[PDB]
Ligand binder design. Structure first.
Ligand code: ZN
Ligand code: ZN
Ligand code: ZN
Ligand code: ZN
Lengths: 112, 319, 81
């Protein structure tokens, strides 16, 4: 009931905080249903491991930010259109100033 | 047209070597008490120390950075016959941790250098016995493991080495080695080794006959898309050489590429043993330091001739 | 015209672009110019001006472009890159 009210008022942080600290098994497990993503390198088309950033067969840094050209360890934002992305804040700031894929593909990833 | 300033950095002991990171925001300095310090530049432009520790049993000669793509990695060579690799881990106070030590040398490890980025994570060490060892880390996520890939004998006391920063698809990897032996006989002091893909072994390609005095420093210049290679040699007089590859006949591909050697500049304004030489980013300005306590900056001109452009003194007083 | 083109190419003066044009001769002239002065910015910007596809396929042009991009990355001029 409490979670439903919180979601009605659109308070996601408090809802997730309650879920994490819940003392009930079902409520604790409510948050872990299909929230894991599978990523593959676009060059070798092979799936990657869950604790590394280097391609096993390509030996390439597949997670290099499109703006800063550094390896990304943590948060990564990705576009479904042009399959490009990078650091969360870098991409956000770049898209605040223009409307082109910073990798230079031509796709207007956020049309207009 | 060069002016000097003093940076408010406090050191208690004599500084042996200073080195920059790739972006020019991080500095590493080795002192006389087997101590290593790291300095960071703030947004305001001020420098602050961030770490310090003692490393080896003997004296510490050289410390160098690695490319940022592999993280924050430092390599330090010591007189106690060791070469250590350090990586920074932060949890935020910086906490530098040694990851591996190379001990294969039988004499004092005189110099250590990193390979260019496009060849992976390779490292080279020249020792006093005349041995150059090239190691590689097969896995970039596990720096604790290294394998000795190549070993070269020079028959003379190695003193300094330098990689070729060229990244073109037509230039095989090149490494140049100097010597500081003061034998009375007139023997060559600079040799160049070019990797061979057909044999997967390094072989001597060209030896500088005109150089016979002891050599303290040698430095390639950044390629920047030119058609030839520029080399700087530090001796009793600063010397500059240009090496141009010859057109390889398509009839048969054999051993090392033949080269044409021409000297383009020879300066003797230091009137002493020149000690250090370095290039800027674009390979257009040369900085030289010798025993006269002066730093000299050389540059080309409209007529493509080399002439001095700056003279300074160690105290910072302009000349 | 042949003699003037040759003497311009060997010297690397940029005024000869009018003679050679954006062809292999232009590439050689630009290479001589870069060797003389070490400027890759102008070469990279010039060679992209409607050059024929074969010209853009040359190794030297792409090497110049890559070196310029690396130089931009060195100064942290990320947006301009
Ligand atoms: Zn891959
Ligand atoms: Zn980024
Ligand atoms: Zn895109
Ligand atoms: Zn897109």
């Amino acid at each position: 009931s409490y979670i439903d009210l919180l979601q009605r008022f659109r308070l996601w942080n408090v809802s997730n905080e309650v879920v994490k600290l819940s003392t009930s098994r079902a409520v604790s497990c409510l948050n872990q249903a299909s929230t894991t993503l599978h990523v593959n390198c676009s060059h070798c088309k092979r799936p990657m491991s869950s604790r590394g950033w280097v391609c096993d067969r390509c030996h390439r840094c597949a997670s290099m930010c499109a703006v800063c050209h550094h390896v990304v360890k943590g948060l990564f934002v990705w576009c479904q259109g042009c399959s490009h992305g990078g650091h969360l804040q870098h991409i956000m700031k770049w898209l605040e100033g223009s409307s082109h894929c910073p990798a230079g593909c031509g796709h207007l990833c956020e049309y207009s | 047209m060069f002016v000097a300033r003093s940076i408010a950095a406090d050191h208690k002991d004599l500084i042996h070597d200073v080195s920059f990171d790739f972006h020019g925001r991080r500095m590493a300095t080795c002192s006389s008490d087997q101590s290593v310090k790291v300095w960071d530049k703030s947004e305001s432009g001020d420098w602050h120390c961030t770490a310090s520790w003692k490393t080896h049993s003997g004296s510490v000669w050289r410390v160098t950075w690695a490319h940022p793509e592999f993280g924050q990695v430092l390599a330090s060579c010591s007189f106690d016959r060791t070469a250590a690799v350090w990586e920074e881990i932060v949890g935020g106070q910086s906490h530098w941790v040694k990851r591996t030590t190379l001990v294969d040398s039988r004499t004092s490890v005189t110099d250590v250098k990193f390979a260019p980025k496009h060849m992976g994570l390779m490292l080279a060490t020249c020792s006093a016995d005349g041995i150059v060892r090239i190691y590689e880390a097969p896995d970039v996520m596990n720096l604790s493991q290294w394998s000795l890939q190549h070993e070269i004998s020079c028959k003379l006391s190695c003193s300094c080495i330098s990689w070729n920063p060229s990244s073109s698809r037509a230039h095989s990897p090149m490494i140049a080695v100097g010597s500081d032996d003061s034998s009375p006989n007139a023997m060559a002091k600079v040799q160049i080794f070019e990797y061979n893909e057909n044999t997967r072994k390094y072989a001597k390609a060209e030896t500088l006959m005109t150089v016979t005095d002891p050599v303290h420093d040698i430095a390639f210049a950044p390629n920047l898309g030119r058609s030839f290679h520029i080399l700087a040699i530090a001796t009793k007089d600063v010397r500059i050489f240009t090496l141009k590859p010859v057109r390889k006949e398509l009839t048969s591909s054999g051993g090392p590429t033949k080269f044409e050697i021409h000297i383009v500049a020879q300066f003797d304004n230091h009137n002493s043993q020149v000690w250090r030489v370095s290039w800027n980013i674009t390979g257009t300005v040369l900085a030289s330091s010798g025993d006269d306590g002066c730093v000299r900056l050389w540059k080309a001109n409209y007529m493509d001739n080399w002439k001095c452009t700056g003279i300074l003194k160690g105290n910072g007083s302009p000349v | 015209i042949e003699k003037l083109t040759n003497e311009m190419k060997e010297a690397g003066n940029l005024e000869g672009i009018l003679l050679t044009g954006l062809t292999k001769d232009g590439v050689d002239l630009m290479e001589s110019y870069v060797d003389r002065t070490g400027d890759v910015q102008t070469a990279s910007y010039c060679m992209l001006q409607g050059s024929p596809l074969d010209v853009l396929k040359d190794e030297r042009v792409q090497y110049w472009i890559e070196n310029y991009r690396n130089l931009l990355d060195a100064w942290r001029f990320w947006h301009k890159r």
